[PDB]
Write a protein that binds this ligand. Structure first.
Ligand SMILES: CC(C)N(C)c1ncnc2c1cnn2C
Ligand SMILES: CC(C)N(C)c1ncnc2c1cnn2C
Ligand SMILES: CC(C)N(C)c1ncnc2c1cnn2C
Ligand SMILES: CC(C)N(C)c1ncnc2c1cnn2C
Lengths: 304, 304
């Protein structure tokens, strides 16, 4: 029993983190096989970031200008290329700790673990969600760029995020491992404002199922609702619309608990309308939306 | 910017987890040098746990009855002994991945990372605090016993917790790595109820400093207080008394922010008396107490 915001064990990813330095800029790279992946803004000064021409800046860079260090050992860079907003530095040594891996582009509402790193060295691990406005709410200081987000399926690491940018409102933007930003963000120090940070309704419902499984039940009520009625209330509270696809995904939790998805939606509707009245659910005073239904099943079943 | 509930990177600990089986009971062990540490209740049936005589039960166990598996490889048990509530299984192979390590007994209010494991295999990592009633609020299913809690100082792992027990109220009890329970708990399936789960005041204050550093400032007010006045209010709200030692520990955060510790205590006093009025601090609707002052400085400074 108990339900915690849980990250994947980080060891497989710790074995991939390296330091990348270009001139005066140091950040993190991801070493998989004989390629190191890092934000292309490693080539920029803070001055450059106001209006960078990355193709032009990259002409002035040679393989020997990219200093790649794996622990206290230097890697030899034998090639470099820009793909979207990442650089791929080809090194002469395959990472001997390369796990089975995939690159995946996740959807808003999907969760992942972040291994926050500085100078190629892991500092901490935490659990994030891709927000509906394609920001993440991370913990990233100067030097954390190139830190990655991932999921693990048994022994395969699915890398889904690389950290690039903090917006002026202190939320974070980054790319998949093909270098494509999530959402509309760019690697330039400019006016970029995030849209509405809506609540991931299907994840809240999953977490309410987790609450019932773990004995927090006070919010269960005598009501039901319909998707259309629920969505009228969701929309008023800046919740994502619930779809039949979401209902289908919640089916296993519904089955485990015997609480129909639409009955849980009616519980959630009352919590939105009435608030918590000073009560807590799984140690939270707000409705938690960074657990997916898969997360809840995984954690409630003890998957390794 | 941003402030997250962050665990230590788990890799050094992942390299120490093994499976221990005795008869029909499987749980986790910690393999350091040529010793595997596990809960002594591995030797119990669920029936045994009602009123176990561990010395008597252990007489019926030989080295060959303890099955220790490290990944898919069996370890040879060449000795076993009981120390308090843990078994030490001596194996014929030193763990080649043994990190620098220490065993430490932590104080209530100290935080640590837990690597939740099943069948010797890591499932997730999360951040815990030793509660003032010497329980922890973890996420532990059947099979998670022997999962460990730790801190890391650069390259040295300080192991502070091993999971033994869930109480009927769904909170958790365990031991240090010398096998001594935190608090009054015992490894028997009996009436054990936790005392008051008071709030760790010094940690709340640290987190309010983290909030100011990260731009959440709405709760700062025009007031100050004294330790004695603050403590009259703390006591009413089941907060731990704040001591001058706590004030001294908060000095670096006070210096960084320019907010006197007693001024932050007056902010906290108003939050206790007035509530959050539907507002949030660092994405929380309650006052978070599982960050120590050291945690806040570490995360705000990017220590690896
Ligand atoms: C970085 C993105 C484009 N990649 C490759 C992917 N994104 C989403 N689903 C995927 C892949 C690859 N396979 N599958 C099933
Ligand atoms: C209650 C019905 C009529 N409403 C408005 C909606 N229901 C489901 N998905 C929706 C909406 C609006 N946008 N999207 C994507
Ligand atoms: C398991 C407990 C008794 N151990 C050994 C410790 N507990 C607290 N502080 C400690 C140690 C060892 N050194 N230091 C400074
Ligand atoms: C305001 C004063 C008189 N009170 C009661 C206290 N102040 C500091 N530490 C305390 C207490 C009570 N217990 N403990 C450990």
């Amino acid at each position: 029993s108990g339900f915690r915001k849980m990250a994947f064990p980080s060891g497989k990813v710790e074995g991939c983190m390296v330091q990348v330095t270009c001139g005066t800029t140091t950040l993190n790279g991801l070493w998989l096989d004989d390629v190191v992946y890092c934000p292309r803004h490693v080539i920029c000064t803070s001055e450059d970031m106001l209006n960078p021409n990355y193709e032009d800046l990259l002409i002035r860079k040679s393989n020997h200008n990219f200093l790649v260090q794996a622990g206290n050992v230097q890697l030899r860079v034998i090639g470099h290329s820009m793909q979207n907003c990442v650089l791929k530095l080809k090194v002469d040594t395959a990472n001997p700790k390369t796990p089975k891996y995939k690159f995946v582009r996740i959807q808003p509402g999907q969760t992942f673990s972040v291994l926050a790193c500085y100078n190629g060295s892991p500092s901490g691990v935490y659990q994030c969600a891709m927000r509906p406005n394609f920001t993440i709410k991370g913990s990233f200081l100067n030097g954390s760029c190139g830190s990655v987000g991932f999921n693990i399926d048994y022994d395969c690491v699915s890398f889904c995020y690389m950290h690039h940018m903090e917006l002026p409102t202190g939320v974070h933007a980054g790319t998949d491992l093909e270098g494509n930003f999530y959402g509309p963000f760019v690697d330039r120090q400019t006016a970029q404002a995030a849209g509405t940070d809506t609540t991931i309704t299907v994840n809240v419902l999953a977490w309410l199922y987790a609450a019932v499984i773990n004995g927090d039940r006070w919010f269960l009520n005598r009501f039901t609702t319909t998707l259309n009625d629920f969505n009228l209330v969701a929309m008023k509270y800046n919740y994502e619309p619930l779809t039949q696809d979401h209902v289908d995904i919640l089916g296993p939790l519904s089955a485990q608990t015997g609480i129909a998805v639409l009955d849980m939606c009616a519980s959630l509707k009352e919590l939105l309308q009435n608030g918590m009245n000073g009560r807590t659910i799984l140690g939270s005073a707000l409705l938690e939306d960074e657990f997916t239904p898969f997360d809840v099943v995984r954690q409630c079943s003890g998957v390794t």
